[PDB]
């Protein structure tokens, strides 16, 4: 049975520390996202891109140079992912023990984690109709993205597919902060030098995640197991994503890379 002891208290303070750091590193939280998507906010109502005409108006009145709509959209998506890498790295630094690891191992974890965490944070921004863009100034429908010419038409479909089932689990920001920390501290990334210290931090994050989910989700006694199955799903999902990022690169031709 479960007891409120010094050990459970320390896992709750670790959970709270990650939440606080999460809120700091990620400007747009799932709570705020869900308020915008459900019209349960006083904040400015986002501009809806549902067709080519509403895209053209949207570019002029979103305020975020290829002559193809499809390429301009994909470029915005890739620029936002660079920004997401920076936010996720900043978050990684807040995880107790992470800045103490071999810098090269710090890089490897982030290098192989960021795509998996980007799919996760995209679900927070999605409902059945589409995805919030431009830090919640815009909303782009799933069916409009799907109408873009090959190979851009299929770019966002697997993120939507993941998000529909991931969102059904009804995680909140407190669950997600720990979930994302478990992903980053994955001891099985290729090329890691010193595995055990990563598994040691991960063990602690897994205990914290399990407790968070028991306290926060009385409706699913095996939510912990289901979340580990999603980390497993995300691995092959990122495989397919990285695959398509190539097919684009060699078939179709950010200021911090230029610097």
């Amino acid at each position: 049975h479960m007891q409120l002891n010094p050990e459970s208290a320390d896992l709750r303070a670790l959970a709270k520390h990650l939440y606080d750091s999460y809120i700091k590193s990620f400007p747009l939280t799932k709570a705020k996202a869900r308020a915008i998507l459900t019209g349960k906010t006083t904040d400015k109502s986002p501009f809806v891109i549902y067709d080519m005409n509403s895209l053209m108006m949207g570019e002029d009145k979103i305020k975020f140079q290829s002559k193809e709509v499809a390429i301009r959209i994909f470029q915005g998506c890739q620029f936002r992912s660079v920004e997401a890498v920076q936010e996720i790295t900043e978050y990684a630094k807040s995880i107790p023990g992470f800045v103490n690891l071999d810098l090269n191992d710090q890089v490897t974890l982030l290098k192989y984690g960021v795509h998996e965490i980007i799919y996760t944070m995209l679900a927070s921004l999605m409902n059945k109709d589409g995805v919030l863009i431009s830090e919640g100034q815009g909303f782009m429908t799933r069916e409009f993205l799907k109408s873009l010419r090959k190979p851009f038409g299929d770019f966002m479909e697997p993120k939507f597919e993941f998000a529909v089932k991931f969102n059904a689990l009804e995680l909140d920001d407190s669950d997600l902060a720990i979930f994302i920390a478990v992903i980053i501290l994955s001891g099985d990334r290729p090329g890691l030098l010193n595995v055990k210290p990563i598994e040691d931090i991960q063990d602690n994050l897994l205990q914290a995640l399990e407790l968070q989910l028991k306290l926060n989700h009385p409706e699913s006694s095996q939510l912990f197991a289901k979340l580990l199955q999603k980390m497993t799903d995300l691995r092959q999902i990122v495989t397919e994503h990285v695959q398509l990022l190539q097919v684009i690169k060699k078939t179709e031709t950010h200021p911090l890379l230029q610097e």
């Binding site: 920076q86 810098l103 890089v107 960021v114």
Partner: peptide, 11 residues
């Protein structure tokens, strides 16, 4: 590319 951004962000 990806490593470049992570390393500079990690500073």
């Amino acid at each position: 590319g990806l490593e470049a951004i992570i390393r500079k962000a990690l500073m």
